[PDB]
Amino acid sequence: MTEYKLVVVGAGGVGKSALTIQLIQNHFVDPTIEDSYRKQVVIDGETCLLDILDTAGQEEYSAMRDQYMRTGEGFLCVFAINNTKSFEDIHQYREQIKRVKDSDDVPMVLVGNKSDLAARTVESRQAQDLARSYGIPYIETSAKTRQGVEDAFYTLVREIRQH
Ligand SMILES: Nc1nc2c(ncn2[C@@H]2O[C@H](COP(=O)(O)OP(=O)(O)O)[C@@H](O)[C@H]2O)c(=O)[nH]1
Ligand SMILES: [Mg+2]
Secondary structure (H helix, E strand, O other), X not given: OXXXXXXXXXXXXXXHHHHHHXXXXXXXXXXXXXXXXXXXXXXXXXXXEEEEEEOOOOOOOOHHHHHHHOOOOEEEEEEXXXXXXXXXXXXXXXXXXXXXXXXXXXXXXXXXXXXXXXXXXXXXXXXHHHHHHHOOOEEEOOOOXXXXXXXXXXXXXXXXXXX
16 A cells, blocks of 8 residues: 655644644644654545654754654645744755755645634745745645645645655
8 A cells, every 4th residue: 555654844833743633633632752643544536544753852953853754755844824933944944854865856845834823923925935935835724623734734645746
C-alpha cells in the first residue's frame, strides 16, 4: 500500500498537534513529546496510508529534530494567523527542510491555522503571497472547526505525488 510520509513543522503553539489529531481522530484537543500517527484513508480514489510526524520539543534547529525530519517526504509548514512571529519563522523552517532533504524542491504546503479566531495579525493576502513566492500552495485552517483540515493534508499528498 502507498504510504505518504508527512511532517508537521512550525513554531510551538501554532496548532500542529490539534491539526493532526483532527485529521486522524476527528475531534479537537503535551507540547514537548514528538511522535508519529498513522491512518488508512482514500484520497482521490487512492486508498493509502498517511504516516504523520508531529514535531515538538524545542523551537527547532537541533540535529535531533533533523534525525526525525529526514525521513519525511512532505512538510506541512504551519503558523497561526494571530501570531506574527510564527509566520516570520516560516522562512527558517523552509530553509531547515531544504537543508535536511538536501533538495531545492521539497513537497510542502503553507498552513495558516486558528482560522476560527478573530483579530488576525497576518492577513490572508500576505500569506498567499509568501506561498506564491515559494511556488507552493497556501491553505487556511482551524483545528477547532475542522475547516480546511482535510484540504491542507490531502493537498500535501498531491504535492508529494507531483514531485
Ligand atoms: N482556537 C484555536 N485554538 C487552537 C487551534 N489549534 C490549536 N489550538 C490551541 O493552541 C494551543 C496549542 O495547540 P497545539 O495543537 O498543542 O499547538 P502545537 O504546539 O503547535 O502542537 C492549544 O491551546 C490548542 O488547543 C485552532 O485551530 N483554533
Ligand atoms: Mg505539539
